Amino acid sequence: FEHATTVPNVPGIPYKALVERAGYAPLNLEITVVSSELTPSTNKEYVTCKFHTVIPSPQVKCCGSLECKASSKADYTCRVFGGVYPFMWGGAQCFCDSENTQLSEAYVEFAPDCTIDHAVALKVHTAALKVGLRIVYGNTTAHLDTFVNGVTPGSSRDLKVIAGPISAAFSPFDHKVVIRKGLVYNYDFPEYGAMKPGAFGDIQASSLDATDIVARTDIRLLKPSVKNIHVPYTQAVSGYEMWKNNSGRPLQETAPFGCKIEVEPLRASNCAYGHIPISIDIPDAAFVRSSESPTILEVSCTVADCIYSADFGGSLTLQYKADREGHCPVHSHSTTAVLKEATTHVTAVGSITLHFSTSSPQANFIVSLCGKKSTCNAECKPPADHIIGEPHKVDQEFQAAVSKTSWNWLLALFGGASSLIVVGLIVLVCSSMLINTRR
Amino acid sequence: TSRNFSVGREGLEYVWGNHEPVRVWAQESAPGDPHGWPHEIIIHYYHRHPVYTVIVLCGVALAILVGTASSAACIAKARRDCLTPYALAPNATVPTALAVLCCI
Numbered sequence: 320f321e322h323a324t325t326v327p328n329v330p331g332i333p334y335k336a337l338v339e340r341a342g343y344a345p346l347n348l349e350i351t352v353v354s355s356e357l358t359p360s361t362n363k364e365y366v367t368c369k370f371h372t373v374i375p376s377p378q379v380k381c382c383g384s385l386e387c388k389a390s391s392k393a394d395y396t397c398r399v400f401g402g403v404y405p406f407m408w409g410g411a412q413c414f415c416d417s418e419n420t421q422l423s424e425a426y427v428e429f430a431p432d433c434t435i436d437h438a439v440a441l442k443v444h445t446a447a448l449k450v451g452l453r454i455v456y457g458n459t460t461a462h463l464d465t466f467v468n469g470v471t472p473g474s475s476r477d478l479k480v481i482a483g484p485i486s487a488a489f490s491p492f493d494h495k496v497v498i499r500k501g502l503v504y505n506y507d508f509p510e511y512g513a514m515k516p517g518a519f520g521d522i523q524a525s526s527l528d529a530t531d532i533v534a535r536t537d538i539r540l541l542k543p544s545v546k547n548i549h550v551p552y553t554q555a556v557s558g559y560e561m562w563k564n565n566s567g568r569p570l571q572e573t574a575p576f577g578c579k580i581e582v583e584p585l586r587a588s589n590c591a592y593g594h595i596p597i598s599i600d601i602p603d604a605a606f607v608r609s610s611e612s613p614t615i616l617e618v619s620c621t622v623a624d625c626i627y628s629a630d631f632g633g634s635l636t637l638q639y640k641a642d643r644e645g646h647c648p649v650h651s652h653s654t655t656a657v658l659k660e661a662t663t664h665v666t667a668v669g670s671i672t673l674h675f676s677t678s679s680p681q682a683n684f685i686v687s688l689c690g691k692k693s694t695c696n697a698e699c700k701p702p703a704d705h706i707i708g709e710p711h712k713v714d715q716e717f718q719a720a721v722s723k724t725s726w727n728w729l730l731a732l733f734g735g736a737s738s739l740i741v742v743g744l745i746v747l748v749c750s751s752m753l754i755n756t757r758r
Numbered sequence: 759t760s761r762n763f764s765v766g767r768e769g770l771e772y773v774w775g776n777h778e779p780v781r782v783w784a785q786e787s788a789p790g791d792p793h794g795w796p797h798e799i800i801i802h803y804y805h806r807h808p809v810y811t812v813i814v815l816c817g818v819a820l821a822i823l824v825g826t827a828s829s830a831a832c833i834a835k836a837r838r839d840c841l842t843p844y845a846l847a848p849n850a851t852v853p854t855a856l857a858v859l860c861c862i
Contacts, residue, residue, distance in 0.1 A: 572773075680792040701790075701802070706784060707782070707783055708780075710783055711767060724799065725792065728796060728799070740828065740829050742829065743831075747832040749836075750836040750839070750840050753840070754839075754840075
């Protein structure tokens, strides 16, 4: 049936729980996040790359005038120069020594190799998280993908899971991102049409084959100072090249929570952040009544050497007596200690050794076998290894982060102070009311 | 050459050259002992969260001991308030056990 539990959003770290129905045998269930994806909504503003400045074949009028026209070409510049007398290899090209105007044009296009080297400007909106979950309850394992919002019934063959809302809202993407050759950057780019010379986004198009390009590259057409035909001009540097020199570090190296950044589509995968509430409806064919599960009559917990570590640094043995054989489950009922196994085979008499992980200096948790509880008591030493290649399987709680010896010392001192103050107050009141009694 | 980096409970990742990334996590392997002696306990917890132990544990325990001074003040008040009645009853008797200390 229904089981409401909160799972930490950490990929690869199993979460174990026990569902205890009032008439059935306890059932083990394990919820693990295998993969997560955080994809936002994106909208392309434009593409940008290095521009190519095209200087056409200049126009020359020998004994007349020319005028500048209008064009739709990106950053189209035009200028008329009179008093011209150009030359080629053959010699002079006009029959008037003066009044021989020349027309200079300039505009920009996309370079031949921009089909590979280009950047896309995107605006990102609300990011939605999707996780892949492995759920094992009893003898069956189930894999499914669910949306962490709180409404969508996550895919569930012979099951039903609802995840969400996520306990925190996190996105590695700012409102504006750029993507170049698979790398992602948080960059505040100019709006479409708001181009500035020498900065990123100085040439803008919807597509690379688009016929309408807008640009602003600060082209200046100068008067020719030589006798051979020449179109002198000066221009600003490529904003795309300047940005490629000042792009900074990508989002694949700066994203928090260990997110892996991927493109097509833009997404952050395998982030570790927050907690995910999950509601699961277990099928009733997965429950067995207590009349079929073994019923042990006693159980004792002995704790071997333990350390509070990121790995299974502890061990314990359960000594039991069951009336028959079977396949009971096991479970630790503390938030600071987790078992490695989930089920075990029990017989008439025997022992089972279990391994655990804790974050607490003291191991005072409760373990169940066939649903019967026993108390484990020991103290765990600090680990010797400083660094490991695993994450910590449990969280650190202030109560179960102080040793019992330290709690005893602190409580002794605080209680001694409180008892001294209480003795003082009782003496004050008593030896004052003695005045009332005596007269 | 060599480079130093800090890693906590949440972990750290480093990528060297064209190699795959490598992740490492830190444990609570501080010097001292949580189960030993008060000086060993304090050394251990001063390396695991130095701010918490000095302030909300050892500073308050110190101020807690100063609060016992107010307890002695009540004793001193209940001592003088009971000993300020000294001589107002002629033709009376006093206990012998207290007659040696009542005069002084």
